[PDB]
Design a protein around this ligand. Sequence first.
Ligand SMILES: O=C(CCCC[C@H]1CCSS1)NCCCO
Ligand SMILES: [Ca+2]
Ligand SMILES: [Ca+2]
Ligand SMILES: [Ca+2]
Ligand SMILES: [Zn+2]
Ligand SMILES: [Zn+2]
Length: 156
Amino acid sequence: VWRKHYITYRINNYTPDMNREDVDYAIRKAFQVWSNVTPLKFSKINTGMADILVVFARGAHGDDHAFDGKGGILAHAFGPGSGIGGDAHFDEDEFWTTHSGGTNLFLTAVHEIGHSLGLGHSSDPKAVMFPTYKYVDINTFRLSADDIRGIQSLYG
Ligand SMILES: O=C(CCCC[C@H]1CCSS1)NCCCO
Ligand SMILES: [Ca+2]
Ligand SMILES: [Ca+2]
Ligand SMILES: [Ca+2]
Ligand SMILES: [Zn+2]
Ligand SMILES: [Zn+2]
């Protein structure tokens, strides 16, 4: 778990699937989901080393977790730690979106940031930490009680 309350993120590179401002907004809204139920504060920085580096990448991309083309694995993230710790990677071979076309970035990012914070997978299909992608309306979205218990067991 992170041992401090102010956490930084940096967007290393932007998918061409989406408007720049939309990538910024989805990711910001996703960190806010977790800010809402912990003492953590998140800030985007533009240069330098962040805690959580947000990367869009395809295939082999320098870690030991290659992506697999369109479908299958959508994204992965490392738990808290220095260097690659915390970093969240999104498969560029998906088509990222604001809505239900393709793969919703916001929802995926909430799930991945959960990992960045120290959460593992849930068995509850209602939880955002369930592995299986299922679109739900991005204004209807709520963490499940399982999710809140999980993160609060780690930070609050
Ligand atoms: O784990 C992911 C990210 C998607 C996580 C699923 C949550 C967020 C999208 S809707 S609920 N890709 C590999 C899963 C595919 O088997
Ligand atoms: Ca990191
Ligand atoms: Ca994939
Ligand atoms: Ca893409
Ligand atoms: Zn990776
Ligand atoms: Zn996962």
